[PDB]
Amino acid sequence: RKQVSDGVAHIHASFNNTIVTITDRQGNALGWATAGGSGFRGSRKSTPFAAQVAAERCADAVKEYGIKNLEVMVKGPGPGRESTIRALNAAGFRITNITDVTPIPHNGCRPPKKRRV
Amino acid sequence: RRRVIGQRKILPDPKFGSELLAKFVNILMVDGKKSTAESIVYSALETLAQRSGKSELEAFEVALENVRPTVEVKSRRVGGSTYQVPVEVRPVRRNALAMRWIVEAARKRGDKSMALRLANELSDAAENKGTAVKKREDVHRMAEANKAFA
Amino acid sequence: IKVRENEPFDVALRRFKRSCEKAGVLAEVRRREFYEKPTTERKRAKASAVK
Amino acid sequence: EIDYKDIATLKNYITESGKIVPSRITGTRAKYQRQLARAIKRARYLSLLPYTDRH
RNA sequence: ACUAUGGUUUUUAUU
RNA sequence: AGGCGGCCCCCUGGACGAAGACUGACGCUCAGGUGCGAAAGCGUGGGGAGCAAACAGGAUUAGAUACCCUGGUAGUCCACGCCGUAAACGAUGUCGACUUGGAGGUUGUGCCCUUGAGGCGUGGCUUCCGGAGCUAACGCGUUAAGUCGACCGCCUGGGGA
């Protein structure tokens, strides 16, 4: 409802899935998709490909909403957290930047115990 | 060194201005007889009036548009960690990777009529599916392999 | 090595690879060289965070 | 182990979400952390620090 | 860490 | 010992710092006996989310009653009692007095204008490396597989058992 051709993309990558949400600065979440909704399972669902096609299916779900530029905010410790630039290039979008929004590593259950030092 | 390639790079056709034609007169034409090979050279545009393809003046441009590869898979073995990574093919080599196809059921066909035979494959390969793309759909299969890393 | 990432950073720390085995093993453990350099000189090295 | 009523020190080890900050990113020792968590638990039960932001 | 299959199961040899 | 982790309050067997004063051999082992569960089994009434023998199915495959997957009982949980199980492996019976260096962790203690997740000595515990001695070998290595001194349990080719 602001018609600015401009918005934000929020990514969250886990050790199974990846979430992609596209939102307007007025708080209207224009569309969302996951690697799970794309029919994938297990380690393949966690891939940068499975995240990229979830973003390409989401760019295909905002294709009547009038938007052309996005700024990216990346979150989660999993693989496939920054392949969305290749989905923007597939859909013809312009990009501002890719910003990491990692929160403080609270809890800290089962990090890799191999070695140390 | 020895390079094992002619690396051509030719001149375009002297009455069509196109480089595509100056490479495609070489298909199903043998021992370089291109000035007496009247039974095949250019004649696929004259026999398309008996085969299912459309707009003969672009029928090779559209057929080539629908068969070319986009990637090649190249291992990077370090331990491994075998890295079966796809990378995109370069803007000339994308055509050379398609040079051997489209004739594999025409050589090798009987019933003479070479020009009508080439117009049959010029209609069948342009479907982006099944024939002429069996190795293109095998690159698509080899592009599934890097997903094993997760 | 190998070992999968659990904390996201775009730049490496050189903390786990070739620093770390090649070299990093069987050259400092248990009284090798000693004198003062692998222990006592490090006990005299000041740190503004633990360590 | 000595205090739980003066919260100026305890706010140095929790976020604006009230969650506890790991010793591995504050230059703090773990044998302190184990008891700074007890001081935070004492001050939560005193209702002067938050338990969870639900709430 | 870097991409699935599961069964049959030698006898004389050596004097 | 089997084992034992949110905070908070009581009660409790051992271990240790340290200045005085008091016993006066009061010490040790142990047949028989007796104390005690990680587990599952006995069972009456409650509980049922994780996980799961049993079990309905999916399958699987040439087949399957199994691997894999959807659901899932006994059981793990609670009160109160029986059972006494195991690799109950710290591979080292319970007790006494000796031997030989190094380095870490953990807890006192003396002194640091505390490089100080402490430092340099000295008491307790303990782990890795390593010497005498002992071993076929692993190695054990002062908390010993060493040195013998007390007392107990048990043995004498393998299978059968």
From Swiss-Prot, chain A:
DNA-binding as UniProt keyword: no
GO aspect biological process, one term? cytoplasmic translation
Q: Which Gene3D superfamilies has this protein been placed in?
A: Ribosomal protein S11
Q: Which UniProt keywords apply?
A: Methylation, Ribonucleoprotein, Ribosomal protein, RNA-binding, rRNA-binding
Gene Ontology molecular functions? small ribosomal subunit rRNA binding; structural constituent of ribosome
Which Pfam family name is an example for this entry?
Ribosomal_S11
Its domain of life reads: Bacteria
What does this chain do?
Located on the platform of the 30S subunit, it bridges several disparate RNA helices of the 16S rRNA. Forms part of the Shine-Dalgarno cleft in the 70S ribosome.
Quaternary structure and partners: Part of the 30S ribosomal subunit. Interacts with proteins uS7 and bS18. Cross-links to IF-3. In stalled ribosomes contacts ribosome rescue factor SmrB.
Which protein family is named in the record? Belongs to the universal ribosomal protein uS11 family.
Tell me more from the record: Has been predicted to contact the N-terminal domain of IF-3 based on footprint studies; exactly how IF-3 interacts with the 30S subunit is controversial.
Protein known as: Small ribosomal subunit protein uS11
Tell me which species this is from: Escherichia coli (strain K12)
- UniProt lists the gene as rpsK
Curated annotation (Swiss-Prot), chain B:
Is rRNA-binding one of the keywords UniProt gives this record?
yes
Example GO BP: cytoplasmic translation
Note whether Ribosomal protein occurs among the keywords: yes
A GO molecular function assigned to this protein is: rRNA binding
Tell me the function of this protein. Answer: One of the primary rRNA binding proteins, it binds directly to 16S rRNA where it nucleates assembly of the head domain of the 30S subunit. Is located at the subunit interface close to the decoding center, where it has been shown to contact mRNA. Has been shown to contact tRNA in both the P and E sites; it probably blocks exit of the E site tRNA.
Q: What else is known?
A: The strain K12 sequence is shown. Has been predicted to contact the N-terminal domain of IF-3 based on footprint studies; exactly how IF-3 interacts with the 30S subunit is controversial.
Q: Which family does it belong to?
A: Belongs to the universal ribosomal protein uS7 family.
The name under which this protein is listed is Small ribosomal subunit protein uS7
Q: Which organism is it from?
A: Escherichia coli (strain K12)
From Swiss-Prot, chain C:
Which GO biological process categories is it annotated with?
Answer: cytoplasmic translation; ribosomal small subunit assembly
Q: Where are the transmembrane segments?
A: none
Which keywords, in A-to-Z order, does the entry hold?
Answer: Ribonucleoprotein, Ribosomal protein, RNA-binding, rRNA-binding
GO CC term, one of those recorded? cytosolic small ribosomal subunit
One Gene Ontology molecular-function label? rRNA binding
Q: Name the residue ranges with Basic residues bias.
A: 43-51
**Keyword Ribonucleoprotein on this protein?**
yes
Assembly, per entry: Part of the 30S ribosomal subunit. In stalled ribosomes contacts ribosome rescue factor SmrB.
Hey, which family's this protein in?
A: Belongs to the bacterial ribosomal protein bS21 family.
Q: Which purpose does this protein serve, as stated in its record?
A: Probbly involved in recognition of ribosome rescue factor SmrB in stalled/collided disomes; fusion of protein fragments to its N-terminus decreases ribosome rescue in the presence of SmrB.
Q: Under what name is this protein listed? A: Small ribosomal subunit protein bS21
Organism field: Escherichia coli (strain K12)
Entire-sequence positions represented here: 4 to 54 of 71
Curated annotation (Swiss-Prot), chain D:
Q: What is this protein called?
A: Small ribosomal subunit protein bS18
What gene is this protein a product of? rpsR
Biological role: Binds as a heterodimer with protein bS6 to the central domain of the 16S rRNA, where it helps stabilize the platform of the 30S subunit.
Q: Which organism is it from?
A: Escherichia coli (strain K12)
Family of the protein in this entry: Belongs to the bacterial ribosomal protein bS18 family.
Q: Name one GO biological process term.
A: cytoplasmic translation
Entry keyword Lyase: no
Subunit: Part of the 30S ribosomal subunit. Forms a tight heterodimer with protein bS6.
GO cellular component terms given for this protein: cytoplasm; cytosol; cytosolic small ribosomal subunit
GO MF term list: mRNA 5'-UTR binding; small ribosomal subunit rRNA binding; structural constituent of ribosome
